[PDB]
């Protein structure tokens, strides 16, 4: 009942949710179900990337920039 209304991505199960979606898409032989699962996985990946960018906007990104320019 809690997970019914509570949306899935929050918060640490992003990787687990993506793996479950990928497994469901692989298991489902249908076309519409596979497309929907693929779209959901892509949306989850984009959301995770945006969240990481927001969190890694400073320091975590500048360090990568300095490392690449130094190499």
């Amino acid at each position: 009942e809690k997970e019914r209304f509570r949306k899935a991505p929050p918060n640490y199960a992003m990787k687990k949710t993506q793996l479950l979606k990928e497994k469901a898409m692989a298991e489902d032989l249908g076309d519409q179900d596979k497309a929907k699962q693929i779209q959901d996985q892509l949306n989850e990946l984009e959301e995770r990337a945006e969240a990481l960018d927001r969190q890694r906007t400073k320091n975590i990104s500048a360090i990568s920039y300095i490392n690449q320019r130094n190499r």
Partner: protein, 66 residues
């Protein structure tokens, strides 16, 4: 894992320079020039900015919540 507060050998504060060192290296300066631009004369204090490995970032990647 994190930049120390003072140089083991000398004792000069070096903790308040890691961010400045990264900024100077990013802008245009090189290492050999940035070190003396920050004010590090003795070679004992220069290892803290050259040898130090910044592992706190990888640790922060494992955020507990959200």
């Amino acid at each position: 894992m994190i930049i120390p507060v003072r140089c083991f050998t000398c004792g000069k504060i070096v903790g308040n320079k890691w961010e400045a060192y990264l900024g100077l290296l990013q802008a245009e300066y090189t290492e050999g020039d940035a070190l003396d631009a920050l004010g590090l004369k003795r070679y004992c204090c220069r290892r803290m900015l050259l040898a130090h490995v910044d592992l706190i970032e990888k640790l922060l990647n494992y955020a507990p919540l959200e």
